[PDB]
Structure formats: structure tokens, C-alpha cells
């Protein structure tokens, strides 16, 4: 059970069935997906991205480690991704607003997470706030790890969907906007736990009532699960 793609090996682990690499793939997952989103929505210019292979089928622009700014943003997502190791990360989302730092978003690219108790089969419960089941829970809990190649296809689906939404579906962003990364901790995460680069906040983000959405794709490595969605006012 391994991903034998020659290109895949550079950015990703060849094996995603064990806890460490399952969590590590997620970190690499966050990095690639949000790189494509930032690039294809033209939040950042080309010069912050390095052309990379995901598979022999698909290329992608990933945040450049050799540019000052893009390296900071890559580091930011790497910290968020590392929190996946102990099940401390509920959600990371690229949040676009009119002004820094509005609560209600114009557009949001969200990755939402779920962790599994042991063997990577039974899902750890993820709740409100009020005790209510999380919106992204059911869909991800029903899933079963189907091998490394299934995960490879999921990563390809996500990046291709990201490219599709920005190229064919989404209206352009305004001349003036502010885009920042906002995350949510799991309840399991202790008070002593904080993710570098992210300020503590009592507020997250909100969406207008008339918000439209689209599913970018899901991820099911051996011991983790994620769903990526696009929320925006600029569809069609």
C-alpha cells in the first residue's frame, strides 16, 4: 500500500496509512491546496510560487520557499498543519473580506478536519459550542481509508477543482480586499497549546445569508480526514 508515482514523492509521503504520515500528508495537503487557491485567485503573483508536480498527470503552483513573503505564508500553514498531529486543529480557512479585519467574509476557502480514535476507523466526535454535531462531521465520518492511491486521487481532485472554480466559476475579487488565514482549535487542545503565527481570537468568521458554496474535495488518509469547500459571493 504505497503511492509509486515518481512525481508525488517530492511533495508528499509515499505512504499515508500510519498516524505520523497521515498527519504529515495533511500538512502537505494544506500547503498545496491553499497555494493553488492563492495563486489561481491571484491573491499572490506568480513570483511567490514554484512550478511543481503533484503527479505525472498534474502540475501546480506551490508557495516558494526561496521568497521572503511566500516562505512566511508557507511557514504559517505548516504550523497549522502540525497541529493535526495531536488532533488540535478543527479548521483552517483562507478568509477574504472587504476590510482588515471584517467578521463577515466575501469569500472563504475552508479545510475542515476530523480525527480517528485508533486504527483510523472510528471517528472522534467533533462538536459545538452548544453540543451540536459539526456540519462537516457526518460526511467525513462515513468515509473509510481505501489505500494510498485513493488519497492520491483525492489530492488531484482537490487541486483540479480549485483550478476549475477560479478559472470557470468565480467572478474576480475586488480591486481592494484583505485575505487572511483563520483557524479553529478543537476542544481537546489544551490551554497551553497555541499555533505559531495565529493570534488568539474570540471571533472566527461569518458568512452572509445568501452565500453560495461548492465542494472542492475530501481527504481520507489512514488516520485523518478533511473536507475542503469554497464559500463566496462571486460565483457565476
Amino acid at each position: 500500500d504505497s503511492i509509486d508515482d515518481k512525481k508525488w514523492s517530492k511533495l508528499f509521503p509515499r505512504i499515508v496509512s500510519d498516524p505520523d504520515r497521515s498527519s504529515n500528508f495533511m500538512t502537505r495537503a494544506i500547503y498545496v491546496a491553499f497555494s493553488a487557491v492563492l495563486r489561481n485567485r491571484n491573491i499572490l503573483g506568480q513570483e511567490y510560487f514554484t512550478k511543481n508536480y503533484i503527479t505525472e498527470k498534474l502540475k501546480c503552483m506551490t508557495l516558494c520557499f526561496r521568497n521572503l513573503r511566500s516562505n512566511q505564508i508557507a511557514q504559517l500553514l505548516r504550523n497549522a498543519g502540525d497541529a493535526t498531529k495531536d488532533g488540535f486543529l478543527k479548521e483552517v480557512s483562507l478568509v477574504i473580506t472587504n476590510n482588515e479585519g471584517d467578521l463577515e467574509a466575501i469569500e472563504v476557502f475552508s479545510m475542515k478536519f476530523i480525527y480517528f480514535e485508533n486504527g483510523g476507523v472510528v471517528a472522534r466526535l467533533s462538536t459545538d459550542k452548544n453540543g451540536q454535531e459539526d456540519p462537516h462531521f457526518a460526511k467525513l465520518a462515513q468515509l473509510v481509508y481505501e489505500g494510498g492511491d485513493s488519497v492520491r486521487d483525492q489530492m488531484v481532485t482537490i487541486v483540479r477543482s480549485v483550478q476549475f472554480l477560479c478559472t470557470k466559476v468565480l467572478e474576480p475579487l475586488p480591486e481592494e480586499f484583505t485575505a487572511n488565514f483563520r483557524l479553529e482549535y478543537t476542544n481537546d487542545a489544551p490551554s497551553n497549546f497555541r499555533i505559531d503565527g495565529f493570534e488568539d481570537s474570540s471571533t472566527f468568521y461569518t458568512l452572509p445569508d445568501d452565500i453560495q458554496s461548492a465542494t472542492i474535495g475530501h481527504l481520507r488518509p489512514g488516520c485523518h480526514a478533511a473536507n475542503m469547500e469554497c464559500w463566496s459571493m462571486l460565483m457565476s
Binding site: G101, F177, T178, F181, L183, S191, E199, D200, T203, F204
Partner: peptide, 14 residues
């Protein structure tokens, strides 16, 4: 130290 469930990063502004 942290009594809040949310994290905010510095952003990119155009």
C-alpha cells in the same frame, strides 16, 4: 494562556 478557540493570522491586502 489561551481561552479562545480561534486563531487569526496576519494577511495579504490588495
Amino acid at each position: 494562556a489561551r481561552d479562545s478557540p480561534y486563531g487569526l493570522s496576519q494577511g495579504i491586502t490588495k
